[PDB]
Each structure stands twice: as structure tokens, then as C-alpha cells.
Amino acid sequence: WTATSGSCKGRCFELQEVGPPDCRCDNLCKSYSSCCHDFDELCLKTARGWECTKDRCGEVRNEENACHCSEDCLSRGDCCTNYQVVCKGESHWVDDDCEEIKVPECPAGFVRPPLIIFSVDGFRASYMKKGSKVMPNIEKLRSCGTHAPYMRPVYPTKTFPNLYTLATGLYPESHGIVGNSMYDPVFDASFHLRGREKFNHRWWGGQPLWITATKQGVRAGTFFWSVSIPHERRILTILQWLSLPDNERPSVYAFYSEQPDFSGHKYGPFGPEMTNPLREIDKTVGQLMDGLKQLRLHRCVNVIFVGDHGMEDVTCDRTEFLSNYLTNVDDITLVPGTLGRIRAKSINNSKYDPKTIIAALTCKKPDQHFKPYMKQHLPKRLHYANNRRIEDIHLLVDRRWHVARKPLDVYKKPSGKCFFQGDHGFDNKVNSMQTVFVGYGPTFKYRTKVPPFENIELYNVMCDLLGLKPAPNNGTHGSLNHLLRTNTFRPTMPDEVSRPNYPGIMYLQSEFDLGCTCDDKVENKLEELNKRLHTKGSTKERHLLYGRPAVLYRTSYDILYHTDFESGYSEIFLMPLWTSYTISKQAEVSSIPEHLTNCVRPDVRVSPGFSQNCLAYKNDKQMSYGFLFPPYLSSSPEAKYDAFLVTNMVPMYPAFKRVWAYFQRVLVKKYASERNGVNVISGPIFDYNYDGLRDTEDEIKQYVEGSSIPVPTHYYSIITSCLDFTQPADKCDGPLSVSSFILPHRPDNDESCNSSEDESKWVEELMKMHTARVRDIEHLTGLDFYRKTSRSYSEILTLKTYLHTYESE
Ligand SMILES: *[C@@H]1O[C@H](CO)[C@@H](O[C@@H]2O[C@H](CO)[C@@H](O[C@@H]3O[C@H](CO[C@H]4O[C@H](CO[C@H]5O[C@H](CO)[C@@H](O)[C@H](O)[C@@H]5O)[C@@H](O)[C@H](O[C@H]5O[C@H](CO)[C@@H](O)[C@H](O)[C@@H]5O[C@H]5O[C@H](CO)[C@@H](O)[C@H](O)[C@@H]5O)[C@@H]4O)[C@@H](O)[C@H](O[C@H]4O[C@H](CO)[C@@H](O)[C@H](O)[C@@H]4O[C@H]4O[C@H](CO)[C@@H](O)[C@H](O)[C@@H]4O)[C@@H]3O)[C@H](O)[C@H]2NC(C)=O)[C@H](O)[C@H]1NC(C)=O
Numbered sequence: 159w160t161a162t163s164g165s166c167k168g169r170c171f172e173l174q175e176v177g178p179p180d181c182r183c184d185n186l187c188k189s190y191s192s193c194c195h196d197f198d199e200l201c202l203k204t205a206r207g208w209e210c211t212k213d214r215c216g217e218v219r220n221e222e223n224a225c226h227c228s229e230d231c232l233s234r235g236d237c238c239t240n241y242q243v244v245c246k247g248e249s250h251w252v253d254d255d256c257e258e259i260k261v262p263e264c265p266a267g268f269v270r271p272p273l274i275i276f277s278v279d280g281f282r283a284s285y286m287k288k289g290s291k292v293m294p295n296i297e298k299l300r301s302c303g304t305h306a307p308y309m310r311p312v313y314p315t316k317t318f319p320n321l322y323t324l325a326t327g328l329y330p331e332s333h334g335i336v337g338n339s340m341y342d343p344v345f346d347a348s349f350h351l352r353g354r355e356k357f358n359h360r361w362w363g364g365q366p367l368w369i370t371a372t373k374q375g376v377r378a379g380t381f382f383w384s385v386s387i388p389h390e391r392r393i394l395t396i397l398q399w400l401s402l403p404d405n406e407r408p409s410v411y412a413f414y415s416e417q418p419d420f421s422g423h424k425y426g427p428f429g430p431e432m433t434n435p436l437r438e439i440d441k442t443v444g445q446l447m448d449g450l451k452q453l454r455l456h457r458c459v460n461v462i463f464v465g466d467h468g469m470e471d472v473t474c475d476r477t478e479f480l481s482n483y484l485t486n487v488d489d490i491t492l493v494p495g496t497l498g499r500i501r502a503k504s505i506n507n508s509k510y511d512p513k514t515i516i517a518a519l520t521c522k523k524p525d526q527h528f529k530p531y532m533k534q535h536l537p538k539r540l541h542y543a544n545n546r547r548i549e550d551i552h553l554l555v556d557r558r559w560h561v562a563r564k565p566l567d568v569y570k571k572p573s574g575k576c577f578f579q580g581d582h583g584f585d586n587k588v589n590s591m592q593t594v595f596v597g598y599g600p601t602f603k604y605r606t607k608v609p610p611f612e613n614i615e616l617y618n619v620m621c622d623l624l625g626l627k628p629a630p631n632n633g634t635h636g637s638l639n640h641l642l643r644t645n646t647f648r649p650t651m652p653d654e655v656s657r658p659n660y661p662g663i664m665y666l667q668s669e670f671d672l673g674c675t676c677d678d679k680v681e682n683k684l685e686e687l688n689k690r691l692h693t694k695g696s697t698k699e700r701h702l703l704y705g706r707p708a709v710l711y712r713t714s715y716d717i718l719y720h721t722d723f724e725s726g727y728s729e730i731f732l733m734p735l736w737t738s739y740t741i742s743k744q745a746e747v748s749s750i751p752e753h754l755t756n757c758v759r760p761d762v763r764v765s766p767g768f769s770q771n772c773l774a775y776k777n778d779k780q781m782s783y784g785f786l787f788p789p790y791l792s793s794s795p796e797a798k799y800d801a802f803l804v805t806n807m808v809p810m811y812p813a814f815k816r817v818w819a820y821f822q823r824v825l826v827k828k829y830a831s832e833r834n835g836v837n838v839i840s841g842p843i844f845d846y847n848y849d850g851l852r853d854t855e856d857e858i859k860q861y862v863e864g865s866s867i868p869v870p871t872h873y874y875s876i877i878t879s880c881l882d883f884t885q886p887a888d889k890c891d892g893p894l895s896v897s898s899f900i901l902p903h904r905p906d907n908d909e910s911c912n913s914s915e916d917e918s919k920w921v922e923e924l925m926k927m928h929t930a931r932v933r934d935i936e937h938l939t940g941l942d943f944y945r946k947t948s949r950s951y952s953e954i955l956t957l958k959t960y961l962h963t964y965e966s967e
């Protein structure tokens with residue numbers, strides 16, 4: 159209930175959200191149907207449109223007009239945005255040359271440059287090039303300011319998860335807005351686009367920028383705009399707020415446009431009808447800039463032009479139906495569309511079984527346009543599992559496709575008439591889902607292109623731009639310092655928590671009762687002296703190129719040196735946390751010799767009590783083992799023995815060994831050929847609770863049968879070379895190039911529908927899907943890499959957030 163016969167007089171677009179018995183006048187009152195009776199009349203004036211004309215210049219102020227062309231309008235802050243152009247001989251901001259903004263040029267009384275976020279729904283990254291001719295204002299921002307070729311959204315590439323990630327710096331799994339539609343089983347409540355539930359505080363986690371600002375003494379304009387407030391009114395409202403007295407004026411503002419998304423759904427990303435919406439967005443940007451210029455704020459404010467996601471061609475005919483796969487389709491509830499999420503229709507159904515649903519949806523048609531996953535098996539780069547609002551069963555849908563439960567759902571009720579031609583929500587590495595970023599203003603750089611980056615990084619930057627300390631978030635603060643002229647954030651490397659042991663030779667062979675054997679008793683003072691040197695670290699500068707990784711948690715581990723590789727060996731997890739090695743362009747690939755096929759050798763630096771054992775692998779009929787440093791890449795027959803040490807061994811399912819062996823035997827050498835040498839760091843990951851963070855030892859749910867050997871959930875590798883590939887990886891002078899992956903350690907290859915074929919036809923496709931940022935690996939292992947390079951730490955943070963996507967341009 160709202161008593162709506164209070165009044166909006168003097169309260170239009172009030173910044174505080176009034177609770178009853180009061181009528182509301184904020185920019186969201188329409189949405190709650192809570193506005194005062196006079197809201198339209200007072201706050202949504204439209205008389206005489208939005209532009210001055212010569213006849214209005216110097217008019218007698220008339221309060222019914224939408225905007226003013228009277229002499230007093232500048233003092234009042236309510237001139238039409240073209241007032242000075244029409245009445246005072248000024249030029250439109252777009253027709254002005256750009257001039258570097260080296261410092262803020264702000265009116266007296268401004269304590270910091272304001273920030274305006276101009277968010278545009280569905281603005282696909284390639285619009286910047288393909289619509290350039292019809293968007294002169296935006297092209298000016300783009301070329302004069304700082305821009306990226308594209309900005310990566312979070313998954314799912316839907317509006318509410320992405321706008322709220324922009325505001326918080328958090329993954330959807332952490333901020334809790336995991337879709338536009340959601341069921342929370344703890345509340346037993348549903349969040350929907352239409353209706354009241356979505357406004358409940360309990361949905362919205364983390365701390366959004368407007369709250370971060372308010373808590374730290376910085377006033378914020380309201381971020382959300384009701385659909386029926388015309389864009390011109392939104393602009394004039396921001397301009398009016400910017401004219402408030404110093405003690406009332408906000409420092410941060412958001413504009414939001416429902417376009418081009420709205421038309422994109424109807425016409426497809428590049429339908430001919432898409433030109434008009436782009437022109438109209440451009441015109442609104444022009445109105446903002448002309449308006450800022452009139453107020454002498456166009457060289458004071460920082461403007462961010464950002465989208466939430468892109469837009470793909472998707473039509474009705476491209477729908478897969480679960481009714482074609484499941485006999486039990488009525489027993490499940492599907493969140494449908496460009497992703498799928500499945501749960502039981504009834505929690506009282508004891509015959510609902512997720513393993514059999516998954517199996518019925520796996521590789522059933524040769525052209526199948528979705529792939530089912532338990533959520534913990536989704537590519538770790540999606541960060542889409544650690545929330546009870548994310549169903550256990552997920553369907554990753556192919557770009558251009560939809561999934562639905564039954565055909566009736568599509569031509570009846572919500573799935574639009576078969577009139578829709580575009581949609582979005584797909585995997586966030588898909589090119590059509592990429593969106594835009596431009597920053598323009600005194601705090602941003604001038605005419606500068608920066609590489610593509612992820613939207614989770616922007617919250618930190620918007621905090622830097624406003625002088626705020628950001629709440630804890632998933633950005634890597636400093637990784638975007640290269641966008642900024644000033645206000646950079648200068649982080650320090652995290653401190654090492656555990657120092658390593660460097661064990662020497664301390665055990666005799668006969669102390670090991672591990673059930674291992676090796677044909678290695680075949681038999682010199684040059685060669686004996688040299689092996690000792692290698693075990694003391696004589697080749698470490700070749701194989702550990704960027705320093706040892708730092709261990710950021712309390713643990714017990716050993717550094718082990720060898721001819722061809724160095725490793726940090728956990729006495730707690732009984733295997734390396736990391737193994738580091740460098741492979742030059744000209745390296746030779748060799749085989750595992752026949753006599754060494756089943757060879758495992760005790761490591762006389764490491765206690766039997768801290769070692770794995772071969773008997774456990776023999777007893778475990780499901781589990782085998784592989785090696786972190788690959789025997790295939792040994793520098794010599796004698797060096798190859800080191801690769802068979804029990805301290806280089808890791809538990810691997812036979813189905814996983816197909817993957818890992820092909821990577822080690824074929825792909826590492828291919829990358830070294832292509833990149834002029836690579837340095838590889840590989841290791842295990844334990845994430846049994848799918849929270850993206852290193853498990854403690856008491857979180858491990860599976861061990862090799864009979865033993866204390868924990869089974870990794872994933873294996874990672876980080877492959878680093880010189881960005882200037884004319885320099886070899888081990889003698890690189892400048893910036894680095896990296897690609898990494900986090901492969902799931904699975905006991906079958908059901909994820910790969912072509913896996914009955916030779917590894918050359920499916921392994922690399924699997925690895926590409928599981929591409930990762932170094933930073934993802936850091937969270938998952940509690941290690942910090944690249945500690946000793948000659949690069950600026952900010953540049954190394956950028957490198958750590960890089961994702962190799964394997965999409966084309
Ligand atoms: C991405 O970045 C984010 C942000 O850094 C990382 O997210 C953080 O991850 C941490 C580790 O998982 C986690 O620490 C938790 O926190 C528990 C307390 O959490 C509540 O309070 C949080 C703080 O609020 C205040 O924050 C600011 C400044 O810091 C203040 O100014 C304000 O006053 C704020 O109020 C709050 O953010 C948090 O929000 C979550 O929960 C809400 C309700 O469920 C949601 O609305 C909201 O969306 C958040 O939801 C996410 O996080 C939860 C987990 O917290 C997750 O379940 C959801 O799915 C979703 O992912 C809360 O309201 C604290 O109780 C925990 O401590 C227990 O566990 C640890 C280790 O497991 C124990 O050592 C500790 O003793 C304690 O154990 C006890 O409890 C156990 C479990 O119940 C029990 O088994 C045991 O026996 C013991 O009794 C733990 O420290 C952060 O909360 C989390 N923050 C956010 C926003 O997500 C994230 O990891 C990054 N991701 C990656 C990949 O890097």
C-alpha cells in the first residue's frame with residue numbers, strides 16, 4: 159500500500175528512497191507503482207520537446223517546458239542540451255577537435271572529477287567498427303579516450319548478472335544474481351524479470367559501487383531508470399544533479415539505455431533495423447556531451463561507455479528440445495534459452511536421478527547443439543558453480559541456438575511468437591557476446607588502445623576514479639592501471655607464507671617399501687660431479703625463469719632440483735604443487751623406453767613416509783598415474799631417469815592420461831616450435847567444493863584406494879614465452895606472452911563426443927574449452943607466480959588476468 163496523494167513538488171528525482179506513508183518521486187517509483195499523483199506532471203514534462211530553436215532563445219522562463227532556453231537556464235542547470243549551440247553561437251562537442259585532457263578542469267567547489275557511467279544494453283563489441291559511420295559522438299569518445307577492442311562479460315551473458323558484476327567487481331556466483339530468472343531453495347523463492355520479488359534485498363549480495371561510495375562519504379546518483387522515463391529526461395536529470403550545491407551533488411552517476419538490446423532481440427545483431435537505435439544512442443551521447451560542455455564540465459568528468467554483453471543471431475527454428483532426449487521430461491524443471499539449468503520438478507520425487515538425466519543428454523545426436531555438465535565440471539574460467547541458486551545440472555548451449563523443454567514452450571507463452579531474431583546468454587568467450595569499453599576524461603589516457611579485459615575488473619577502476627577503497631572483489635587491483643593517467647593503484651606482491659625445505663640425499667633405497675620397481679641399476683667423476691650439480695640447482699635458471707612461485711598458505715614442502723625441471727613437492731599432498739621446466743624451439747621429443755614403461759623410482763631426498771607408493775595404484779582398479787615433467791622431453795637418456803621419480807608422479811584416470819599424454823608428447827613441443835621455446839609450470843588442483851579456491855587437506859573427497867594420496871580434481875599448466883617471438887623464451891628482454899589451462903581430471907571423456915577418435919582430433923578442442931587465466935590458477939592453488947621478472951608488477955598483473963580465448967577476430 160502507498161498513500162500517493164502526497165506531492166513531488168520540489169522532489170523530482172529525489173536521491174534518497176523514501177519509505178511510507180510517503181509517495182515516492184525517485185527514478186524507480188514507476189517500477190514499484192509508488193509515485194505521487196503529480197509525478198508525471200511535475201517530473202516528466204515534455205512540452206515543446208528537447209531542443210532549443212532560434213525562436214525560443216532568450217524566452218521568458220516557462221515552468222511547463224521540458225527544458226529551457228531562457229537566459230537564466232545555465233544558472234538553474236536546466237537548459238536544453240543544445241541551448242548554447244542554438245542561442246549562443248557555440249559548436250556541438252562532436253565538431254570540436256580533440257584536445258588532450260591532462261588535468262581536471264572543473265568549476266570551483268568540485269572536490270574530485272565526477273564519474274558518469276553510460277551503460278548500453280546489448281552493445282556488441284563489433285558495433286564500434288561496423289556502426290562507426292552513424293555514431294560520430296561515440297567514435298569521438300573512442301578515438302580521443304582510452305578504449306579496448308572489446309570487453310569480456312561474465313557468464314551467463316545476460317543483463318542482470320552483468321550489470322550487477324559491473325557494479326560489484328564480483329562473479330555472479332558470489333554476488334548471487336546468477337541469472338535473470340532464479341530459484342533460491344533456501345528462501346524457497348523465485349526471482350523473475352516481471353514482479354516484486356526481484357526487489358527484495360536478500361537477492362543482491364556483495365557491495366555495489368553506489369553503496370561503496372555512500373559508506374565512504376561520496377554521494378551517488380541513482381543507477382536504475384524506469385523504462386518509461388525517456389532517455390532525454392535521464393540526461394537532463396543527470397545534468398541537473400550535476401548543478402546541485404557542492405554538499406548535495408553526487409560524484410557518481412549511471413545512465414542506462416535499453417537499446418540496442420531491445421531492437422537486437424527483434425531484428426538480430428545486424429538487422430537493417432539496427433542502424434536507427436545506434437544513431438539514437440549516439441544522439442543521446444551527443445546530448446550528454448553538449449550538456450556537459452554548457453556547464454563547463456566536459457573537461458572535468460570521467461565518462462565510461464560500457465555494455466553489459468553482445469547479441470547473437472538466434473531464431474525459433476534453432477531450438478533443441480529436451481523432449482527429444484528424456485522419457486521423463488515432466489519430472490524436471492528447465493530454466494531455458496541460451497543456457498539451460500535443470501532441477502527436479504518435485505523434491506518429493508525419489509526416482510529423479512541426475513546421473514541418468516546427464517547420460518540421456520550426452521552425445522545422443524551427431525550435431526547436438528548443447529552439452530550437459532554437472533556444474534562442478536563446467537570450465538573453471540566460467541566461475542559458475544558456488545551458489546545454491548545454480549542448479550546441479552547445466553546445459554552449455556551452442557552459439558546461435560536455444561534449448562527448451564518441449565516444443566509447446568516455444569510457439570506458446572514466453573519464447574517470442576517466433577518473431578525473435580537475436581539473443582545472448584552464451585559462454586562468455588563467444589565473439590558475438592563481447593561488449594564495449596571506452597573511458598574518456600582527465601583520469602583516463604589520451605588516444606590509447608588497451609588490450610581486451612574482463613568486466614569484473616572495472617569496479618576497482620571506478621573506485622580508483624572516485625578515490626574509494628573497493629570492497630573485497632574478483633578484480634585483480636592494478637591489472638587495469640594501464641588505462642589510467644593517474645590514480646593508479648600500486649599493490650605489493652603478496653607475502654610468502656611458507657618457506658621451502660631444500661632436502662639433500664637422506665634415505666637409502668632399501669628404506670622404501672613402496673611396491674615400486676625400476677630397471678635402473680645400469681652404470682666416472684665428470685658425470686658424477688655433474689649430476690650432483692644438477693641436484694643442487696645448477697640448471698634452475700634455465701627451468702625456473704620467473705622465480706619460484708610463492709606459497710601463500712601454511713604448509714610443508716620441498717624444492718627438488720633436476721637437470722630438466724624443478725618442482726615444489728608437498729609433504730602434505732604427497733606430490734608437487736608445481737613443476738617448472740623450459741623446452742627450447744629445437745628440443746627433441748623422445749619415447750618412454752620399453753624397459754622403463756612401469757619404472758617408478760624412490761626419491762632419496764624425500765622420506766618414504768612422505769612418498770606415494772606403487773602398490774596403491776596397483777590395488778586401485780580405477781586409478782593410474784602420470785608424470786608432471788614428461789619423460790618424452792628429457793634432455794638425454796640419463797636425465798630421463800629423473801622423470802620416473804616417485805616425487806614426479808600424480809594420480810590420473812586412464813581416460814585422463816589420453817589427454818595428458820597427448821599434451822605432453824605432442825602439444826608442448828608444438829607450442830615450443832610456434833613460440834620460440836616455452837616455459838611450462840604444471841601441477842594438480844583440488845577443488846572438491848567447487849568454490850574456485852584451493853582446498854585444505856580435510857576437503858578432499860577422494861584418495862587412491864588404500865592410501866593417503868589425494869586425487870586432484872583438475873590439472874593445470876601455464877605456458878609462458880616471449881611476446882617478441884624472435885627472442886627465445888629463456889632469453890626474453892621485454893613483455894611475456896602466456897596461455898594456460900585448467901583441465902578437469904575426469905574418469906571418462908564423455909565431455910568430448912569425438913573421443914573414440916585419435917587424440918589429434920579432440921584433445922586440443924578440449925584444452926581450448928578449458929583455457930584459463932593465471933589468476934584462476936592462483937586462486938585454485940594458493941600460489942603466486944611471476945615473482946621475479948624484470949617487468950612492472952602492474953604489467954605482470956595484466957598478464958595474470960589474460961585469457962587465451964581461441965576465437966578469431
Ligand atoms: C570473489 O571475491 C569474493 C569476495 O572476496 C570471494 O568471496 C568471499 O569468499 C570467502 C571464502 O569463501 C568468504 O568468506 C566467508 O565469509 C563468511 C561470512 O560471510 C558473510 O559476510 C560477508 C561479509 O559481509 C560484509 O562485507 C563488508 C566488508 O568485507 C562489510 O563492510 C559489510 O558489513 C558486509 O556485510 C558477506 O559478503 C557474505 O556474503 C555471502 O553470503 C550472502 C548470504 O548467503 C550472499 O547474499 C552473498 O551473495 C555472499 O554469497 C557468496 O558467498 C557465500 C560464502 O560466504 C557462498 O555460500 C555463496 O554461495 C556466495 O558464493 C556473508 O553474508 C564466513 O562465515 C566464512 O567463514 C567460515 O568458513 C571458513 C572457511 O570455509 C572457516 O575457516 C571459518 O571459520 C568459518 O567456518 C565456519 O563456518 C563453516 C561454513 O558455514 C562451517 O563449516 C565451519 O564448521 C565453521 O563453523 C568465510 O570466511 C566471503 O564471504 C565471500 N564474499 C562474497 C561477497 O562472496 C570469492 O572467494 C572470490 N572468488 C574467487 C574465485 O576468488
Ligand SMILES: O=C(OCc1cc(Cl)cc(Cl)c1)N1CC[C@@H]2CN(C(=O)c3ccc4[nH]nnc4c3)C[C@@H]2CC1
Binds near residue numbers: 277382413419
Ligand atoms: O536501469 C537499469 O540498470 C542500470 C544499471 C547500470 C549499471 Cl552500470 C549497473 C547497474 Cl547494477 C544498473 N535497470 C532498469 C531496467 C531493468 C529491466 N531489464 C530488462 O527488462 C531486460 C533487459 C534486457 C534483456 N535482454 N533479455 N532479457 C532482458 C530483460 C534490465 C534491467 C536493468 C536494470
Ligand SMILES: [Ca+2]
Binds near residue numbers: 774775776777781782
Ligand atoms: Ca590402477
Ligand SMILES: [Ca+2]
Binds near residue numbers: 850851852
Ligand atoms: Ca575449494
Ligand SMILES: [Cl-]
Binds near residue numbers: 906
Ligand atoms: Cl577415454
Ligand code: NA
Binds near residue numbers: 907913
Ligand atoms: Na567421449
Ligand SMILES: [Zn+2]
Binds near residue numbers: 280316318
Ligand atoms: Zn543486457
Ligand SMILES: [Zn+2]
Binds near residue numbers: 317419420582
Ligand atoms: Zn537482451
